[PDB]
Design a protein around this ligand. Sequence first.
Ligand code: NDP
Ligand code: SF4
Ligand code: SF4
Ligand code: SF4
Ligand code: ZN
Lengths: 95, 23, 176, 156, 208, 139, 303, 114, 383
Amino acid sequence: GVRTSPTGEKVTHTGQVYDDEDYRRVRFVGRQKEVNENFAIDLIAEQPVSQVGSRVISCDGGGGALGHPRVYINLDKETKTGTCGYCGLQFRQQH
Amino acid sequence: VKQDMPPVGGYGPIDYKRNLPRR
Amino acid sequence: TYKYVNLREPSMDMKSVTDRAAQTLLWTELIRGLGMTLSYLFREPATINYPFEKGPLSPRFRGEHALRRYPSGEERCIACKLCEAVCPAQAITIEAEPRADGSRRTTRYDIDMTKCIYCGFCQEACPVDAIVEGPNFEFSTETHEELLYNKEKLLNNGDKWEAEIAANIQADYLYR
Amino acid sequence: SRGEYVVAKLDDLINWARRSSLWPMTFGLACCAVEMMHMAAPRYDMDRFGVVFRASPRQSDVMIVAGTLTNKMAPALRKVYDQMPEPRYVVSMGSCANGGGYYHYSYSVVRGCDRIVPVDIYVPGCPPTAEALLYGILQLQKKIKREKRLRIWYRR
Amino acid sequence: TRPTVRPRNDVAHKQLSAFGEYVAEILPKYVQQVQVSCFSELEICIHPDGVIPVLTFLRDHSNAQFKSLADLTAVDIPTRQNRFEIVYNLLSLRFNSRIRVKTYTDELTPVESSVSVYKAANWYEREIWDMFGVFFANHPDLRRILTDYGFEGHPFRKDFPLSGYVELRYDDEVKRVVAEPVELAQEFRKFDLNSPWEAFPAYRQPPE
Amino acid sequence: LKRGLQQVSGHGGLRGYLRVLFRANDVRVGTLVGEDKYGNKYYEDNKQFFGRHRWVIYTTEMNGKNTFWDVDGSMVPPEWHRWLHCMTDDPPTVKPPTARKFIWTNHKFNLSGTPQQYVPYSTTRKKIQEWVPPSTPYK
Amino acid sequence: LHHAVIPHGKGGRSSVSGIVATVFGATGFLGRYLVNHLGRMGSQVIVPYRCEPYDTMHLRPMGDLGQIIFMDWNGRDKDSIRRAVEHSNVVINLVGREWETKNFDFEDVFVKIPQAIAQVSKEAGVEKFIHISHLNADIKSSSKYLRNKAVGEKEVRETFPEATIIKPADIFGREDRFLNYFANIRSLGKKTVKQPVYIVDVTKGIINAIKDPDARGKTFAFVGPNRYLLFDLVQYVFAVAHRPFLWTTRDKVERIHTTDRTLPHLPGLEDLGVQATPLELKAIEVLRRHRTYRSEIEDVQPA
Amino acid sequence: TSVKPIFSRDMNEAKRRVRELYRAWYREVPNTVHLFQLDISVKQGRDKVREMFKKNAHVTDPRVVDLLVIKGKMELEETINVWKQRTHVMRFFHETEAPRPKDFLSKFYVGHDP
Amino acid sequence: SNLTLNFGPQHPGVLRLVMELSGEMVRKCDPHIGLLHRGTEKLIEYKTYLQALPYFDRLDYVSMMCNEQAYSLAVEKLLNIQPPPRAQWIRVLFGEITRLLNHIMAVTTHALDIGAMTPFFWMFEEREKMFEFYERVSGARMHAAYVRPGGVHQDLPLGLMDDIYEFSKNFSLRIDELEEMLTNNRIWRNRTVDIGVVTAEDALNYGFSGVMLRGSGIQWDLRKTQPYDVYDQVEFDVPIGSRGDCYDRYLCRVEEMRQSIRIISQCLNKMPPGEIKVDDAKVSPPKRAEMKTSMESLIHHFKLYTEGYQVPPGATYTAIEAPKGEFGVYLVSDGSSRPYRCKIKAPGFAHLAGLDKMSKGHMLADVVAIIGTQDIVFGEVDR
Ligand SMILES: NC(=O)C1=CN([C@@H]2O[C@H](COP(=O)(O)OP(=O)(O)OC[C@H]3O[C@@H](n4cnc5c(N)ncnc54)[C@H](OP(=O)(O)O)[C@@H]3O)[C@@H](O)[C@H]2O)C=CC1
Ligand code: SF4
Ligand code: SF4
Ligand code: SF4
Ligand SMILES: [Zn+2]
């Protein structure tokens, strides 16, 4: 689920793992580097690419006042799916 | 409709007098 | 409309002066105060047992804020810096980078719980409701190092519960 | 191992004896003092845990720093802290006390009460709930449970 | 204009206009600006040679009682020659009125020290001396209230920075609290929030 | 007066009534709402005043910490943390909401003064990328 | 050196100086003053302790937010010591109890402790290891203490050749051993030259030796500016303590009757460059606790 | 520029008031160093008092010298009273500076410092 | 000569007091205050309006909504906004609740500062229920900001006024039992009658405000003379003191608690269901549903929280009847998004100015009773 450097310490979702010439490896002695082991990139590549039969479609976020404000996105390119900046989940068109 | 909090037809009295039994 | 007090004269009627003398000699009202203290002695105590009965609260309680995330999705934050702009203690520290996907995101989202006055302005300033002041009071930290929450302590704290936070927001999203 | 058995149980006895009473003094400058007075309320007791308010510095086991620790106050703070016996334990209560807090970027405010006294238990909040302060005092008692003073004295 | 707009009254506005004109008629020597704002509170802007005559007139004279004294401050304004503005804020008892006597001064001028005609101005004057730096002559006691004794710099000025120059910490060398130059742990990010586009056209000063 | 026989004989008798007496303080058992994984039980009584509605009884061996004595807070899972602070009127056996597969199934409790606690660090990669000297020599 | 090891700006209190010091012992007297001067420098101090966390709690608020760090160690396992000096710029050896125990003696504390830590700090790959030893530590007799420290100096000179052996005299300070030991008494009258040196000059010498190279390898000696007699020292400290009066082991009394001598074959303070202070100022500082309420500066200065 | 004075008319009364205040600070030191239980001899205290008087030596305006006399008289009253503690009187000194040097070369080895 | 005692910051609030006393009956007392100095005015000068509202929430700390009400009415007076009526009535209800809270803490801490221990515990159980109300309303225990300039933010949830009604009945009985306990208690009357007399002429020259003016004669209520809100529609009366006693001032505080009970009763009975905040998106933030499904609401939310609303240039001084007295705020605002200089008139500061005339001819236990008998919190006295 997570990568780990050959120094033995876990990387994060941001690649900030320390080198061989630091002292923060010594500040982590005896106390665990509480890293979130749940990356945010790979939980979207597992999502189904939705296919909506219109041309320009809405995005709420699953609930009135529970979610991002409405974005209306366009689906006119043929090789690149439209992508909500808030959501991150894609759409396509069907005709 | 509206779902505020008004009282229900007006509440009862609340005493505001110094009460002593002088027994 | 004024209602002024401390206006009585000592009545030279025999009953009033002998009642004041009986008050002075026979210790009437001090035993009356003893009677009031005995009346609260024979009550039931209005205490709660702490480690078994945690006290009552409200569904909008403010404390131990953490980051939410989407239903079956990624992080909810945008690094739009509204919370850093509104934070009156100036405790928020945001550094933003986009990842390889192209969505704008972060690198660093650090909050000092020491500086945090716990207003609620970062709860209410967030447009997508990413940071929410949580339910509880569980800090009690031995070191000054550990009260400085990184993004990943915030995400573990937002993944230790969402059901609580989602229940409180679903209880109270029609007021704010 | 009979001597180590005796010394371990005696250490547990004296650590229970220390954590049993723990009657503090109340320093308490600003509104965190009012919240200490609200954990002196009947709904959150102190005499269930041996804790009795006592402003005598010479017989107070632990001390609760609470309120904005200013530069005019802090010499008087450590002047109180010195005349205090050989077990001394400090609870920093409130955002003003545990790292400066809301008055952090100002003159005449010490940036947290780590600059004057050592601090054992931080309890953040503004004000930290009397319920939360009571939780912090229980974790202070468990720090008293984990002292191992007499075991280290034996195996010195 | 009826909902959510504060309704102003014109009776108090006309009365405070008439009374400010009356005050400036009967005291011609010390009066420069007589202004009434939109929400009807009087302001009289004053040369610093008449603090005792204006306040002895205003505490008495039986047509304006003004027994009570409130805030005194001397708001620290740069860009001028005379920087400080001392604001005596007088409240009456028989009349329900509020006037602000605003006299001006620079950094090195004694104003006439109103402690003899308002006993409430004792700690107000001592506090303004300690915080701003305006000396008050013929005054019983000037000490430092609301500051440390070893601290100086008159900190409420705009010239004194937000964080001070000294910072205390305990050390075990000399076994006491010592003062060191400030080494902050975070920047105090100053934000550039003053956006353009002139949110009030009614307050446009005339250009050069 | 007569409850005290049936308060002992209903709680379990000589055995359990003394154990929960020496546990912390109180003996008000008798409502039996529901137990929970990590063993602990939740009892909501209705007759007592507001503050003594709902109590919890913790069990031993939840993370191998010998929690018979020195019981903390923070050992309760968050649905019962909503229920127990009086924010609702229904137990979480009715509707446990918003399952959300990323949610912890372990609930690692309050962990200060352990080998496993939080340390702060900069979640930020390389700043300015210092120069690298060439490997080859000259002459 | 990597970045975040370069210095930045002024000194102390989140002003990053460029050293990471692993400081052995450090719970007693001299280590606490040295951690005080390193927290004033604004460094990272790794203190290992084997005792209760209450004493490192008393020396805790010295450094800034997370500058100093605490870790456990022992005198038996090399793994905890290598974990202590995993990554460290410098390491200093300040250890030794003035009386025996049932678990550790004067034997093999000064032989088994510095060999193990010098071995694992050479193998971990650090530089500028500074070891303190007592003055006049010789193979010649009359102290188990001093012959063990002489064997320790020879062993730390043998292994890890680029070490800084530094040796102070009988240092005196606010919480001294020997001067407080003199004030807490009741005594004899003999003659013995002895030169105390004040502790803040010694630790300024140590921090200058720890951040000022060209002093690596060479052994240094601290000489106080006084060098006078013990009898007039005792009468001066009683006269400043306002009392006339005309663990106490045999090794301690033979240390305070050992004639401290100096050899100029190794350089002192001036080739390192910090001013020394005389007795009397700091003596009037430390000699409090006279009586209920209770100057005559003697200044013998023999030879 | 007919300016209102504070106390004086020219520099003559300024010199008279500052020598009066220096006489007071000279006779005020040994009482305080006996009282607050300091660690510094009387001669060093008097030398730093006259150093504090030699610090402001280039001041020429009479109102400014009058205001400095007022500052010194306020602090002398607060030190002849027992209001100020040991901390502030030791804060007048400088024992915990580790003072930064003034040569260009040692300002160059710890740089970015004009 | 005479005994110059130095009462330090130990508890008999927190101060330092140097008293050159004669012989168990004093001569010259000087309060050295300023030990709790924080720098509120400089911090508000370097911050915005909405961000520096909690400084006005906590410069006084026992009163927690009247100080918010004073600063919010300063900004609403300068900015020309009348708040909606339901916001005004909730503001009045919480002003009366905070008034009840501050008077009952002043009574109990004066009783404990003399030395009586138990009504402290009783009325702090009552104030625990007060804080339960504050928790249910805002979410904070004590420091609820909650009062925006532009009306009450985020109105009270459904199911509160019945609890306030129950609390009104039970609290009337509990204050009647406090008068049953104390008040004709003989040793307490012996403790405080003839100490700290104040002439009304000196009450006006020394600038006393609020309860001191009620005790020393002259009838002066801001709520009756200058109605700054809907106080003109609720009917109540103010208590006046005949003699200048401390016992008289105690009676005045108890009767102000009782009149706060009356105003809470009428405010519950006459609540209009108008609206939460103002009808202007440029001052109050828009609600979250319109924010999400509206463009202009998102733009006004974003700019109103980053830059804040601007304020027209000008200076104002408003003051409201806080339980300590005329709590005053004097704003000076250059036309910008930050205030230029704010300053606070503290009734505790004005009362502590007259400590010499209140403790000239009495002993030192009476000095402690005088320091207690004025609701002085030593955080508001600092400014
Ligand atoms: N007269 C003097 O003071 C002089 C002293 N020195 C040297 O200074 C050093 C420190 O002396 P000082 O502070 O006065 O006395 P201490 O004995 O108190 O200091 C030694 C430190 O090392 C620790 N220590 C000692 N033995 C052991 C052990 N076996 N295992 C683990 N830790 C140990 C001590 O206790 P703990 O285990 O609790 O940490 C303490 O922290 C010594 O090495 C001494 O040779 C040199 C010249 C003069
Ligand atoms: S306001 Fe919300 S979306 Fe914006 S930076 Fe803060 S947490 Fe992220
Ligand atoms: S609640 Fe805390 S983090 Fe949020 S805006 Fe306030 S001080 Fe900042
Ligand atoms: S932390 Fe908050 S509650 Fe405590 S003193 Fe500071 S402002 Fe008051
Ligand atoms: Zn979307």
